[PDB]
Amino acid sequence: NLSKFCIDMTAMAREGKIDPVIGREEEIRRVIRILSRRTKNNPVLIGEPGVGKTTIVEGLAQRIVNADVPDNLAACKLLSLDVGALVAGSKYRGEFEERMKGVLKEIQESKETIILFVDEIHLLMGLKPMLARGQLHCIGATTLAEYRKYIEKDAAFERRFQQVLVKEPSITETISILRGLKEKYEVHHGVNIADAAIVAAANLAARYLTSRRLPDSAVDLIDEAAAAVRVARESQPEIIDSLERRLRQLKIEIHALSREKDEASKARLAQAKQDAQNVEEELRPLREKYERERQRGKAIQEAKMKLEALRVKAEDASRMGDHSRAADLQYYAIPEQEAIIKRLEAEKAAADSMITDVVGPDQINEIVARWTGIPVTRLKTSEKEKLLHMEQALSKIVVGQKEAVQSVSNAIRLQRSGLSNPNQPPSFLFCGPSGTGKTLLTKALAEFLFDDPKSMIRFDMSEYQERHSLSRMIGAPPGYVGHDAGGQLTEALRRRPFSILLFDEVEKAAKEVLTVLLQLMDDGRITDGQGRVVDAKNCIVVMTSNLGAEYLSRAIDPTTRELVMNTLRNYFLPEFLNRISSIVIFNRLTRREIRKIVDLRIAEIQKRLTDNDRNVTIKVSDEAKDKLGAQGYSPVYGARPLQRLLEKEVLNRLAILILRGQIREGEVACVELVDGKVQVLPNHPD
């Protein structure tokens, strides 16, 4: 009787050590009617990993034990065999083989009818289920991937089964199930939880965590926050502990000093006894109220515990049909237990402060923070405050094109405002000079809407001038050259549901690229060339250009802009150009913004000086700033090389003198332009 490797799930249900799961109940009816079939009643669930599809199976069992059953399955037994440990732990497949045999035949020793759950049946391949369609049932579940790679291959074994699928949980499902789990985890923890805390928690858990799968991801992070709150609750206050440690030192000092003959010892000993009484009359109030609130939480825990105990005893008697004694329990303990609970909440709120049972969202926010390396200071806007400070925050990054950034902000407001076409995310055409922080501006928007660079991928339209580039970007069927790597943009979107789509220098991308990405953007979506499902209405798309610089005269006027847009609409499909939510105009960067740019750069420098103890101050003199701007000013590319220019100009001799020591820590890197070629004016000779 080697059920040892298997657990009677039905018993566990009757044991009531399980957690009632919700959602996907129509799927429950689906698999139920499937088992009612005689054609092929042994299905497999199409299941993405990490969805706790387990939880589904157990919900099935729970409903099963409780008359929620087609009578044919009256006393069938869902059990649980750890197939993995069973198969892989066998150092020799023969014992594995005889294990398989014995369990198979003993299953046929169905003194009562049972139906075991099994997973990863492909791992049973690597054909011994010779009679699975007879004298046997199969509770299958996995992704469609395994079903294809192993099951779709075979004919008999596969055809013995049926396909059923469960999807990624929507927010609402998580909401409900977490509302459920609230009480359970509380009773296990004796702490408090805020609904909206859970809501925002699971929200951010979806925003991030894509590595792991909802819902159980949110569940576990909630549990971790809870235990953190529990660890703080379990600990006595640090001020008390420190005081008691001081008190132990004082007791030792008293025992040491009392045996001494000197009025110094005697005076300090009286002092020590006195302050012992002090710290005692101090902590013992707080210490005892700590004990008291602990007893309160203990009463809470054991009260909820006996509540669940008597309630499941009454439920057991209900399953026995003891409506008399079941109702006796229901109307002799249940609401009275609830009254106990109300009194407990009353006394605990009346105690209201060092320790709080509640879980401020901030805590789990810190958890996910060190899970992501970003402060929740960033994770609090819901894009709203991200907008209401967008202009200014972005200005603090780059400046000079207040008009352009202004329009960008307006249209992005519209996108967030949910009133512009959410299918087609607003798209934009950078058009002006080059080396203007152009790509820097792109990355700036990227982060400012995500606070992470991974949400932006480089895709220049220069490589994408042709339909071969079309086939490589949009992917291709198995029979074209733009398929083996998938498609660049295809996979790029396959990973992210939230990102910006860079289209650099689109005056290289031919009209056909315009039209195909029009197919895409018009609903922010097309069907990939590889043959999958892909939609990114949450993502962002932006184009760039610089042919308008040629218009620009060294000091934006609509006059020039007019002819620019003319040249665009006659170079690029005006209807496609109508998909651009805003033409991002630019002008000649005058010397003031460039001065401030170089100032920001020397700021990056001084702060990297701060990045170590080795930290002196730059003093870029006005004339130095201006001359270096004039020099590194690249009318071809604004001042894009000016940065290398400046760093190679100063930083070299700077570090030279530094590691030589001609200027030591904290002093001035007085950037004083000598003869137009500034020298790093040293301070310590040889």
- Looking at the Cβ atoms of 135 and 417, the one nearer to a copy of itself is 135
CB atoms within 10 A of CB 674: 9
Options 315, 451, 627, 683; binder of a copy of itself; rule CB under 8 A: 627
238 is a site residue for a copy of itself (CB under 8 A): no
338: tokens are 């609830």
Nearer to a copy of itself, 420 or 679 (CB): 679
The CA–CA distances, whole Å, from 466 to 430, 510, 542 equal: 21, 6, 19
Q: Report the C-alpha gap between 77 and 72 in whole angstroms.
A: 12
Report d(CA 216, CA 56) in Å as an integer: 12
- Contacts of 336-345 with C-beta under 8 Å, sequence gap 24+, read 337/303, 337/306, 337/307, 337/310, 338/307, 340/299, 340/303, 341/300, 341/303, 341/304, 341/307, 344/296, 344/299, 344/300, 344/303
Q: Dihedral of the CA atoms 156, 159, 160, 162 (nearest 10)?
A: 160
The residue from 49, 82, 97, 135 that contacts a copy of itself (CB under 8 A) is 135
Shorter beta-carbon distance to a copy of itself: residue 102 or 676: 676
How many CA atoms lie less than 13 Å away from 250 in the CB half-sphere?
Answer: 19
Interface size with a copy of itself, residues (CB under 8 A): 42
Instruction: Copy the structure tokens of residue 289.
Output: 């109220």
Q: For a copy of itself, which residue of 134, 373, 418, 478 counts as binding (CB under 8 A)?
A: 134
C-alpha 53/C-alpha 380 separation (Å) is: 32
Pick the closer one to a copy of itself by CB: 82 or 328.
328
Of 110 and 382, the one with the shorter C-beta distance to a copy of itself is: 110
Residue of 33, 98, 113, 665 that binds a copy of itself (CB under 8 A): 113
In the stretch 44-73, what mask flags binding to a copy of itself with x, by CB under 8 A? -----------------------x---xx-
Question: Which residues partner with 166 through β-bridges?
Answer: 47
Q: Is 38 in the site for a copy of itself (CB under 8 A)?
A: yes
- Give the x-and-dash track for 648-677 against a copy of itself (CB under 8 A): x-------x-----------------xxxx
Q: Shortest Cβ distance from residue 567 to a copy of itself (Å)?
A: 14
CB of 83 to a copy of itself, least distance (A): 22
Q: Which of 94, 126, 321, 373 contacts a copy of itself by CB under 8 A?
A: 321
The least CB distance from residue 631 to a copy of itself, in Å, is 4
Smallest distance, a copy of itself to C-beta of residue 652, A:
8
β partners of residue 427: 580
Q: Which is nearer to a copy of itself, 71 or 613 (CB)?
A: 71
Q: Calculate ∠ Cα 453-393-542, nearest 5°.
A: 50
**In the bound complex, what is the minimum distance in angstroms from residue 662's beta carbon to a copy of itself?**
9
End-to-end CA distance of the chain: 91
CA atoms within 13 A on the CB side of 63: 21
Question: Of 109-117, 186-194, 239-247, 579-587, which segment contacts a copy of itself by CB under 8 A?
Answer: 109-117
- Residue 188: count other Cβ atoms within 10 Å of its Cβ: 15
Using CB under 8 A, which of 324, 353, 392, 570 touches a copy of itself?
324
Contact 354, 232 (CB under 8 A): no
The single residue among 407, 515, 527, 631 that binds a copy of itself, judged by CB under 8 A, is 631
Among 162-170, 451-459, 614-622, 643-651, the segment contacting a copy of itself (CB under 8 A): 643-651
CB of 291 to a copy of itself, least distance (A): 44
Site for a copy of itself in 74-103 (CB under 8 A): 74-75
Is residue 433 within 8 Å of 546, Cβ to Cβ?
A: yes
DSSP 525: B
Q: Which is nearer to a copy of itself, 41 or 409 (CB)?
A: 41
644 scored as a contact of a copy of itself (CB under 8 A): yes
Report the residue number, 98 or 550, with the smaller CB distance to a copy of itself. Answer: 550
Give the x-and-dash track for 240-269 against a copy of itself (CB under 8 A). ------------------------------
Beta-bridge partner residues of 585: 431
Least separation in angstroms between residue 660's CB and a copy of itself is: 10
CA distances from 671 to 443, 625, 646, 651 (A): 31, 9, 11, 11
- CB nearer to a copy of itself: pick between 189 and 640: 640
CA 179 – CA 174 distance, rounded (Å): 8
Among 85, 88, 131, 440, binds a copy of itself (CB under 8 A): 131
94 vs 685 by CB, closer to a copy of itself: 685
Among 635, 661, 666, 667, binds a copy of itself (CB under 8 A): 635
- Return the residues of window 439-498 that contact a copy of itself according to CB under 8 A: none
Q: What residues from 542 to 601 belong to the interface with a copy of itself (CB under 8 A)?
A: 546-547, 550
Sign of the CA dihedral with 417 first, then 422, 425, and 426 last: negative
Strands of the 679-680 sheet, one edge to the other: 617-620, 668-672, 679-680
Tokens of 406: 């202004």
In angstroms, what is the minimal distance from the CB of 7 to a copy of itself?
20
Interatomic CA distance for residues 184 and 180, integer angstroms = 7
What token pair was written down for 361? Answer: 């969202």
Question: Can residue 111 be called a binding residue for a copy of itself (CB under 8 A)?
Answer: yes
Q: Are 528 and 471 in contact (CB under 8 A)?
A: no
* Cα distance between residue 263 and residue 486, in whole Å: 89
Q: From the CB of 73, what's the least distance to a copy of itself, in Å? A: 9
Q: Does 112 bind a copy of itself (CB under 8 A)?
A: yes
Minimum distance of a copy of itself from residue 676's CB (angstroms): 5
- What radius of gyration, in Å, describes the C-alpha atoms of the chain? 35
Find the part of the chain contacting a copy of itself (CB under 8 A) among 126-134, 150-158, 239-247, 346-354: 126-134
- How far is Cα 535 from Cα 123, in angstroms, rounded to an integer? 33
Nearer to a copy of itself, 577 or 645 (CB): 645
- Note whether 36 binds a copy of itself by CB under 8 A: no
Q: For a copy of itself, which is the closer residue by CB, 109 or 613? A: 109
- What b-and-e string marks burial along 370-400, b requiring 16 or more CB atoms within 10 Å of the CB? eebebebeebeeeeeebbeebbeebeebbbb
Structure-derived torsion over alpha carbons of residues 195, 198, 201, 203, reported in degrees to the nearest 10? -80
Q: Using the rule CB under 8 A, is 104 a contact of a copy of itself?
A: no
Instruction: Please calculate the CA angle 181-184-188 and round it to the nearest 5 degrees.
Output: 135
Indicate the residue among 159 and 284 with the shorter CB distance to a copy of itself.
159
Residue of the chain from 393, 641, 651, 683 that contacts a copy of itself (CB under 8 A): 641
Query: Under the rule (CB under 8 A), what is the footprint of a copy of itself?
Result: 38, 67, 71-72, 74-75, 110-113, 131, 133-135, 320-321, 324-325, 546-547, 550, 627, 630-632, 634-637, 640-641, 644-645, 648, 656, 674-677, 679, 685-686
